[PDB]
Write a protein that binds this DNA or RNA. Sequence first.
RNA 1: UUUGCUCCACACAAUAUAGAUGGAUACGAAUAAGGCGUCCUUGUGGCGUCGCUGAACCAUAGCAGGCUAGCAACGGUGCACUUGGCGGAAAGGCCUUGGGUGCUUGCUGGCGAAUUGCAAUGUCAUUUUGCGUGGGGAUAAAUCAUUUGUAUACGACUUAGA
RNA 2: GCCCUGAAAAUGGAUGGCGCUCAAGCGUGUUACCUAUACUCUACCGUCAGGGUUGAUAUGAUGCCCUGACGAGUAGGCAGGCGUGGAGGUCAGUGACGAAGCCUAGACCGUAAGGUCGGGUCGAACGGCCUCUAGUGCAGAUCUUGGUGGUAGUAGCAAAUA
RNA 3: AGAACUGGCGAUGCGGGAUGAACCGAACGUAGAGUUAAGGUGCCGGAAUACACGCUCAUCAGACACCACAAAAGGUGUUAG
RNA 4: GAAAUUGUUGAAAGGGAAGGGCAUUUGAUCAGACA
Lengths: 197, 106, 172, 49, 127, 96
Amino acid sequence: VEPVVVIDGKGHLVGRLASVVAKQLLNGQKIVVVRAEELNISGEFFRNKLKYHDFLRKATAFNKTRGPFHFRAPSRIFYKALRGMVSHKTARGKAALERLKVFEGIPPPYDKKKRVVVPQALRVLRLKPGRKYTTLGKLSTSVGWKYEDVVAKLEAKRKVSSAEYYAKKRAFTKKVASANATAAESDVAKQLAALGY
Amino acid sequence: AESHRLYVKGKHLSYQRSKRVNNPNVSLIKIEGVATPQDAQFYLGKRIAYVYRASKEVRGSKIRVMWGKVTRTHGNSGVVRATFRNNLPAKTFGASVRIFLYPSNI
Amino acid sequence: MAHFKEYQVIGRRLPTESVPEPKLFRMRIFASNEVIAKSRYWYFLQKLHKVKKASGEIVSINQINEAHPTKVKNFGVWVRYDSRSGTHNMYKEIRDVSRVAAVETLYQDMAARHRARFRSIHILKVAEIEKTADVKRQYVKQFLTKDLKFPLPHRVQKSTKTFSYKRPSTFY
Amino acid sequence: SHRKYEAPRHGHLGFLPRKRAASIRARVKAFPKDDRSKPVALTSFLGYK
Amino acid sequence: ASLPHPKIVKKHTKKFKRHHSDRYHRVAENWRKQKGIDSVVRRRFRGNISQPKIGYGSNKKTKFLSPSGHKTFLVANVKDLETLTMHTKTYAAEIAHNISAKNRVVILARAKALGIKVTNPKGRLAL
Amino acid sequence: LRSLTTVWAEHLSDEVKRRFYKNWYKSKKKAFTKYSAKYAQDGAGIERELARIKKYASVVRVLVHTQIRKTPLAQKKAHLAEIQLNGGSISEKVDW
RNA sequence: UUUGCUCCACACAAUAUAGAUGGAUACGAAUAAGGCGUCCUUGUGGCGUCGCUGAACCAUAGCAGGCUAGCAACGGUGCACUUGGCGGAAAGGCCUUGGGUGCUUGCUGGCGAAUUGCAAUGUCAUUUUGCGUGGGGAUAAAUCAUUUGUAUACGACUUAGA
RNA sequence: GCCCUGAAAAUGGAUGGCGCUCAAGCGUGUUACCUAUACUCUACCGUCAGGGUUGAUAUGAUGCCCUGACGAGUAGGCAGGCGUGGAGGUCAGUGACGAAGCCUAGACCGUAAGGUCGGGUCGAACGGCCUCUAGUGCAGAUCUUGGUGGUAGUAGCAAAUA
RNA sequence: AGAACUGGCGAUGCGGGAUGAACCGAACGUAGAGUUAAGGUGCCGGAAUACACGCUCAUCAGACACCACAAAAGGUGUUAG
RNA sequence: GAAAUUGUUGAAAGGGAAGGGCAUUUGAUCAGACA
Ligand SMILES: [Mg+2]
Ligand SMILES: [Mg+2]
Ligand SMILES: [Mg+2]
Ligand SMILES: [Mg+2]
Ligand SMILES: [Mg+2]
Ligand SMILES: [Mg+2]
Ligand SMILES: [Mg+2]
Ligand SMILES: [Mg+2]
Ligand SMILES: [Mg+2]
Ligand SMILES: [Mg+2]
Ligand SMILES: [Mg+2]
Ligand SMILES: [Mg+2]
Ligand SMILES: [Mg+2]
Ligand SMILES: [Mg+2]
Ligand SMILES: [Mg+2]
Ligand SMILES: [Mg+2]
Ligand SMILES: [Mg+2]
Ligand SMILES: [Mg+2]
Ligand SMILES: [Mg+2]
Ligand SMILES: [Mg+2]
Ligand SMILES: [Mg+2]
Ligand SMILES: [Mg+2]
Ligand SMILES: [Mg+2]
Ligand SMILES: [Mg+2]
Ligand SMILES: [Mg+2]
Ligand SMILES: [Mg+2]
Ligand SMILES: [Mg+2]
Ligand SMILES: [Mg+2]
Ligand SMILES: [Mg+2]
Ligand SMILES: [Mg+2]
Ligand SMILES: [Mg+2]
Ligand SMILES: [Mg+2]
Ligand SMILES: [Mg+2]
Ligand SMILES: [Mg+2]
Ligand SMILES: [Mg+2]
Ligand SMILES: [Mg+2]
Ligand SMILES: [Mg+2]
Ligand SMILES: [Mg+2]
Ligand SMILES: [Mg+2]
Ligand SMILES: [Mg+2]
Ligand SMILES: [Mg+2]
Ligand SMILES: [Mg+2]
Ligand SMILES: [Mg+2]
Ligand SMILES: [Mg+2]
Ligand SMILES: [Mg+2]
Ligand SMILES: [Mg+2]
Ligand SMILES: [Mg+2]
Ligand SMILES: [Mg+2]
Ligand SMILES: [Mg+2]
Ligand SMILES: [Mg+2]
Ligand SMILES: [Mg+2]
Ligand SMILES: [Mg+2]
Ligand SMILES: [Mg+2]
Ligand SMILES: [Mg+2]
Ligand SMILES: [Mg+2]
Ligand SMILES: [Mg+2]
Ligand SMILES: [Mg+2]
Ligand SMILES: [Mg+2]
Ligand SMILES: [Mg+2]
Ligand SMILES: [Mg+2]
Ligand SMILES: [Mg+2]
Ligand SMILES: [Mg+2]
C-alpha cells in the first residue's frame, strides 16, 4: 500500500515477523523493521540460549572464516531469521533483501515516521498466555552483543522527546475536535451526517 | 486533479508454476484490495497493461507496454491468472502492472 | 468419519423354504452416509448372528432425527474400544444438543485422548441422562450449576489486513 | 588413529594471523577505566626505546 | 501474388543441433541421434535437448510454402523458367547459383514478362 | 564508538606537519593553513566545535606528538597519536 | 601535457531505473487490561466515554486542469525570503517570527474545449554521465628514480632529499 | 494417551532449509485451493485399418477422397529416406561475362539426415533426374600420420677455486 | 545367500517421495483449453498463518508409508479411563 | 590456403568453473508482405 512500511518489532515473534517480512519483500513492498531487540521468541529464555549455542559450534573446520558466520545483534538474529525464507542466492533474491532494513532502536528518518504492526506475528495475540517466551536483546546480549545498554539509553531518550510530541498533539486535537463540534448541528454538517459522515 | 488513475494497482507475482517447473505463458497477478476469489471474479477479463521504459525512442515515445487480460481467479485469496500478448519478463516479478476497468459491465 | 447421521437399519436372514419369515433384527447405526451404515449393520450383526450379508437381506433403512433438536441434553456414552495392548470398555458423558452431534465429538475425543480411530470403536449405547445429579463425570456437572456465568478473557480479533496500525487489545 | 603420546601443541592461536602488522605504531586497543573525579591528565605516552 | 492458403504454423523453428555439438569443436551441429546407454539425452531426462521426431512434421497444406506462398523452384535458364508458365501463384523461380551474370538478366527479364516470381533477383546485378 | 569531530591547534610544528606527507621537501606545505584561518575571525567556528564536543562526546582524547628533534634519531617525521583523557567531566576535559 | 577544478543557476544532449502515478499519517506502556475527555485531595484517584478494526484519517471538482470578473472572509495553503529556537543514533530533519507573492472549489459569473474521429500507457517520476556558457569560491599532491635499515625473497614496509 | 528418565563417538550440520509451542507439533473431522508427458474436448503429424473413385476432354493409379483407432523403448528385426567415389542413358543442363572449393551469430525448404540462395574469396572445371556400382558417411578404438595448445616465458641454464 | 505367484527395474521418461534404478501416481507423436492423480498449500514454493474438538512445554520436544532405528524397566508431569 | 591454434581491432558478459532447455525484456540484424 505505502512506499515504505516501518515495523515496530516490539512484541513480535521472530519467525513469524520473518515469514511475513519475506513475502512483503518478494512482492516488492519495501520494508523496514525497527526496535529489533524488543522482539520475542517462543520458549523460555534458556532454551533459546542453548539453540543459539548449537548454532555457534557450526563452523568450517579447516578455516573458521569461510564457514558459517555467527551474528549477535538482534537485528541480524532477525535478518538471518528472514534470509532463510528467501531464495537468497538468486537475483530476485538479492533484489528483495535489498528492499529491507532491520534496526535495533529507532534511528533517524524512521522515528518521526509512524510504524505499524503485523497482527499475525504480534505475540500477545499469537501466543497462549502462560507460555514462556524470550526477548531478543537479552538473548543477543548473552551471546556477545555489545550494545544493549547503549540502545535502551538512546531509546529512553527518544521515548522522551516523543511523549512531548504526542502531548502537543493531544492538545491540538482537542481544539480540533472542539472546533469540529461548534460546527455540529449546522446545515452542512447535518447534510454530511446524512451521507454517512 | 492530483489523481488521474483510471485503473487498479496490481503487482506481478509469479509465473504459474509447479513446485519446480514454471510456465511463462501465464502470469499470476495480485490486484490491490482484492483478497478473495469472489472479490476477484469482478476483474476477470479486464485488460492488463504493464508499462515500462527504454533508452530507444520508438514510435515517438520512450514508453512501451505489453498487454494482457485477467482470465481467472487464483487459489483462495483474490490472486489472479492473466495471459498477455507476449509473456512477461520475469525480471518483472514484483513489479507494477496496471489493471483497467474496461471492458466493464456497469 | 464425516458428519454423522443416525440410522435404523433392519435386516433378516433370507427366506428359506422351511423357514419363511425369519426373525428380523434392527440396530441404531451411527454413520455419515447410508452405505457405510448398511455396512456397519452387517459388520456388527455378523458378530452376533449366524449370518453374513450373502445369506442375509436389508429390509429397511431410515434416518432418525433428533427428538428435540434444540433441547440441550446431557448424554452418557458407553464405548468399547481397542488400544495398542488390550481392548477396553469406557463410559463418557457428553453435553450437547443431539445424539448425532455428540457421537461425533465422541469419536473425536477418543481420537485425541486415546488415539482410537473409527475402526477401533464400538458405540455400545448412547442414552440421555434424564435426571441430573446422575451426571457422574464432572466436566459436565461443572455446567449444571445455577446462574452459571463465565467471561472469556484475552480476546483475539482475527486481523484481515496483513498489517495493522493500532496495537490491539484483548479486552472483552 | 589417535596420537600415541599426547603432548601440547605449538604456538598460540590467539596471536593469529602471523602477518606483518599494518603499522610500526602498535595500537592502543584499550584504555584504563575512567573515574571522572581525579584531576584530568594523559593516559599514555610516546617513546623511543 | 500467391495462392490463398492457411496461416503457416511452423511447429519448431529452432534448429535441432547435435548433442554436445556445443561442447567439442569436432562435433558438428549436424544432427545425430545418440546411441549411448547412459545418455541423458537419449533417455530424455528433463532439461536436456529436444530430438527430431515425426510429431514435429509440418502441415500437409502449408508444407514447403515459403513466406510468400509459393513452393520455390531452382531455375537455371529460361526454358526452365517457362515450366512455371502457368503456375505463378503456386511456384516461384529461384535462379541457380552458378548462373552467369548476363544470363540472369535475361532470365529475370522473362520472369517479368511471364509474371513469374523470382526470389533472388539481386543476384550478380550490375548497379 | 564514532569520531564526531577533531579540533586542532592554531600553529603546528613542522615536526607534525611532516607526518601528513610523503614527499615533504618538494611539496608546498599547505597543510593546516585554511584550518589555521578559522582563528582569524574571533574564533567562532573553533568555539562551536569544542562546544559540540562538550554537549555530546562520551569520551575525549588528545592529539599529541613526539618532539622527535630532541631525539638523536635521524627521522625528523614526528609521531602523532590519540590519547584518552581520564579526568573529571567531559566538559572539564575539553577545557584541559 | 594546450584553460584544467569546484559549488550555485539553464542549455543541449546522452544513459540508465527490481519498477512514482492523491499522502511511509511519529507517544509510551499494558493485554486476567487500556485510549480519550473531565473533576479533584494529583492518586495504583473520582466520574464519563470509546473499542468489536485503517472500510480510518487527510486530500480530492477546474485544457494532465486553460483564460477571466466579483462577493464573503482575515481563513487555508504553494514559493522565494527574514526572526528566534530545537535536533549527533545515521543528527542533514522539526518548529517558530515577520513582511512579499501565486492559488483557493468558501460562494456567484463570463469564455474555452470537437476533427486524438468508438480503446491503442498515449508519454507529466528520477538515474548517473558528458559538452560548451557565466554567477561565486579554490591554486595540491602521489608515484618512478635516488636514498635509510627500526623492514625486506620480489612487491611491500620505515626514513631522507629546493 | 502425549511428555520426561532409561538414551555414549569421533571434520561443523541438518523434520530438505528458515523457523514454529491455543503450532507451522500429535490424533481426528469438514470444506476450499495448488499441478504431470495421465483423463475430456480441438488442431496439426505419422502409423494401421475400413470405405469411395479410370469416364473422357488436364497436371500424379505406387494416386485422388471420406472415415475410425493408435503413437514409450536398450539389444534386435524390417521399412522409407539422406549424403560421397566411379558407370550407362538424359537434360542439345552449369561455366573464364567466373566451374569446383573455402569463409559468412545473412535469407529460405525439410521432423531429420541434409537441400537452396545471397555476399565474400577464388581460378577450370561441375551439376539435376532414371538407372548401375562400391576401398561409400566417424567422436571415441592406450586407434594411424601429420599439425596445434594449456602447462610456460615456467622447470631450469648452480659440479670441475677466478 | 536361496526357492514360489505376481507386479516391476533392467530397456523408461513424466508427477510425488527434498535427494535416490526397484516406492506412490501415471507410462511419452507436436500443441491450445479444462480437470485431476500421488503429493502438498507460514516463508523458501504454485496453493487457507482455513474451519473444528481434544492432547502435548522437553536445561538434548515433535513433525508422515517404503526411510534412513531404538528396547526392557521406570515417573506424585499431565490427560482420559 | 579449411580446422586446431595465435595477433590486432569492434561489440558483449563475468561475486568459487563454462557450456545447455522452455519463455520473454533489451540491443543489434533480416526476410516477407502491402498495394
Ligand atoms: Mg529473477
Ligand atoms: Mg504502534
Ligand atoms: Mg502474561
Ligand atoms: Mg460397516
Ligand atoms: Mg589420546
Ligand atoms: Mg542403462
Ligand atoms: Mg556413463
Ligand atoms: Mg551420459
Ligand atoms: Mg519453399
Ligand atoms: Mg562536524
Ligand atoms: Mg645516527
Ligand atoms: Mg586542455
Ligand atoms: Mg500519556
Ligand atoms: Mg489544578
Ligand atoms: Mg492526572
Ligand atoms: Mg485515525
Ligand atoms: Mg471552471
Ligand atoms: Mg485552478
Ligand atoms: Mg537510514
Ligand atoms: Mg481545486
Ligand atoms: Mg505528457
Ligand atoms: Mg627554493
Ligand atoms: Mg498429546
Ligand atoms: Mg541435509
Ligand atoms: Mg531428532
Ligand atoms: Mg511445515
Ligand atoms: Mg486432518
Ligand atoms: Mg491437524
Ligand atoms: Mg472433507
Ligand atoms: Mg469454505
Ligand atoms: Mg505426469
Ligand atoms: Mg500433451
Ligand atoms: Mg487427442
Ligand atoms: Mg516407437
Ligand atoms: Mg553419385
Ligand atoms: Mg573409389
Ligand atoms: Mg564462385
Ligand atoms: Mg562473388
Ligand atoms: Mg590454370
Ligand atoms: Mg572404407
Ligand atoms: Mg580410397
Ligand atoms: Mg576424428
Ligand atoms: Mg577422441
Ligand atoms: Mg608445445
Ligand atoms: Mg624469453
Ligand atoms: Mg626461473
Ligand atoms: Mg641442477
Ligand atoms: Mg510393485
Ligand atoms: Mg544389461
Ligand atoms: Mg522396461
Ligand atoms: Mg516406468
Ligand atoms: Mg506422490
Ligand atoms: Mg525422505
Ligand atoms: Mg498399490
Ligand atoms: Mg530456502
Ligand atoms: Mg505462495
Ligand atoms: Mg533436543
Ligand atoms: Mg529441536
Ligand atoms: Mg507404520
Ligand atoms: Mg598461397
Ligand atoms: Mg554466463
Ligand atoms: Mg532464446
